Paper text:
The interaction of membrane-bound active RAS with RAF is the first step in the activation of this pathway. Active RAS recruits RAF to the membrane where RAF dimerizes and becomes active. The N-terminal CR1 region contains the RAS-binding domain (RBD) and the cysteine-rich domain (CRD), the CR2 region contains a 14-3-3 recognition site, whereas the C-terminal CR3 region includes the kinase domain and a second binding site for 14-3-3 proteins. Here, we present crystal structures of wild-type and oncogenic mutants of KRAS in complex with the RBD and CRD of RAF1.
We crystallized the GTPase domain of KRAS (residues 1–169) in complex with RAF1(RBDCRD) (residues 52–188) and solved the structures in two different crystal forms, I and II, at a resolution of 1.95 Å and 2.50 Å, respectively. Despite having different crystal packing interactions, the structures of both crystal forms are very similar, with r.m.s. deviation of 0.40 Å for Cα atoms or 0.45 Å for all atoms. In addition, crystal form II of the KRAS-RBDRCD structure contains an extra salt-bridge between RBD R59 and KRAS E37. In crystal form II, CRD interaction with the linker region also includes a hydrogen bond between residues P135 and D186. The structural superposition of the two crystal forms of the KRAS-RBDCRD complex shows conformational differences in the linker region, partly due to different crystal packing interactions. It nonetheless shows that the short linker region plays a role in stabilizing RBD and CRD together as one extended structure. Since the mutant structures belong to the same crystal form as the WT KRAS-RBDCRD structure obtained in crystal form II, we used this structure to examine any structural changes in KRAS and at KRAS-RBDCRD interfaces.
Numbering used by the authors:
A (entry chain A): 1 to 63, 66 to 168
B (entry chain B): 55 to 188
Write the structure that this text describes.
Amino acid sequence: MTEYKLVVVGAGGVGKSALTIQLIQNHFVDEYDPTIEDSYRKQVVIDGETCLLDILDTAGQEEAMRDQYMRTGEGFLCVFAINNTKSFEDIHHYREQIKRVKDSEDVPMVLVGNKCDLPSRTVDTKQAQDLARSYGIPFIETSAKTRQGVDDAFYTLVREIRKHKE
Amino acid sequence: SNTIRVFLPNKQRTVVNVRNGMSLHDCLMKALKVRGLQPECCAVFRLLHEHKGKKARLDWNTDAASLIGEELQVDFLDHVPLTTHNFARKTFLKLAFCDICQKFLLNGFRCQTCGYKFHEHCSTKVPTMCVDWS
Ligand SMILES: Nc1nc2c(ncn2[C@@H]2O[C@H](COP(=O)(O)OP(=O)(O)NP(=O)(O)O)[C@@H](O)[C@H]2O)c(=O)[nH]1
Ligand SMILES: [Cl-]
Ligand SMILES: [Cl-]
Ligand SMILES: [Cl-]
Ligand SMILES: [Mg+2]
Ligand SMILES: [Zn+2]
Ligand SMILES: [Zn+2]
């Protein structure tokens, strides 16, 4: 079985843990428990092939510890909240860090806009589409509350890793 | 910080922030249940770093603050009926239903150990641990 090492990065409180736990446990965590370091393993069937997802859930508050897990990671979910423009612009800093430890502009990444269930939207789809177009990466709208696009976000990142491996 | 790095079953890990007074059980309940693990099926150990052994078992109700700075490991108890799934592609010629969504299942996937049958788009909802009491 092929193992894919996934890393979830983004500003504190954008829903990195809620998206991961919604994928692993199929439950929505509505409390704020700021992550320090959390790894998850789970079998998923993607395009007919079973594979093992090793997901590292990181800290948005950054508890230089990132570089180690950023070097060993195979794919990255750059997550922001559609009601938090600051986190949307913080995405640029996270891609700068990953590119600084990967030594390449061609890193498997997927821009994820979370919290789409909220009506207080401050980042529209065109903005994130343009940012994802600028980076050459896909963009996925998600909501860990409703599980909308949760599978789609992780499935897309795995497909990015498969095509990156040629 | 007042944190503890705890290695978890199936090559997983977490770092918990100890609140004064909490036991190891209190700090690790959420990390286990979110990963589909039951604390009743597990033991918590202190990783030993000398020649004597590899780890020493600890009582779940041990005060977590007394172990700040040590590396811990939670393992399955001996021979608990918990394992990982063994998925396989499977076309159901006869009418069948998905264990996750209860809809028709023509070309799905079935675990060869527990029998869980499901669509591809339902695999993430399959429980992480495979229960085998055969
Ligand atoms: N409405 C809504 N709330 C969400 C969504 N995702 C997360 N939240 C809420 O956002 C808060 C923080 O979520 P959490 O997953 O802890 O975020 P994080 O990005 O992992 N935080 P941290 O970096 O600190 O570890 C929680 O209250 C959670 O319920 C979503 O899609 N919709
Ligand atoms: Cl849900
Ligand atoms: Cl597993
Ligand atoms: Cl053991
Ligand atoms: Mg988190
Ligand atoms: Zn099974
Ligand atoms: Zn189904």
